Amino acid sequence: SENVQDLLLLDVTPLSLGIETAGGVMTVLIKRNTTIPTKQTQTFTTYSDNQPGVLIQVYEGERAMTKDNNLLGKFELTGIPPAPRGVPQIEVTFDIDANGILNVSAVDKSTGKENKITITNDKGRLSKEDIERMVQEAEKYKAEDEKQRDKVSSKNSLE
Length: 159
Prior knowledge:
four-stranded antiparallel beta sheet; 9% helix; peptide binding; molecular chaperone; chaperone; mainly beta; protein folding
């Protein structure tokens, strides 16, 4: 909670919470000491021609990977709009609640179609020791890997 001015109410979660996608790797739209609650909409696309169905897996932590931070919450979203290879698409929408609880929603938004998981953050209390080692490299070095493992299997896909 980095207070540059006096009356700043900074309810922040210690890590940048993202996802293990396609062949299991990281995408973070969030940040370290993130002022949660937050609804961050990262739009992914597809690898097959006309309608895939995608595997979404949350890993709270790491950079461009399946390294070693908090594995919690994985779901399959399916019912995609049928355009040609790389144009069918899905919004992996991260709706975090104020006690660090991640409501992860994959939306086929041109189709008006979402499925969501509410991940309760108790099986893992990393705190000062794991956050100071991983996310002083990870969130910096992720959007700096250049949407790291965002450019992957197709373009921005999780298949």
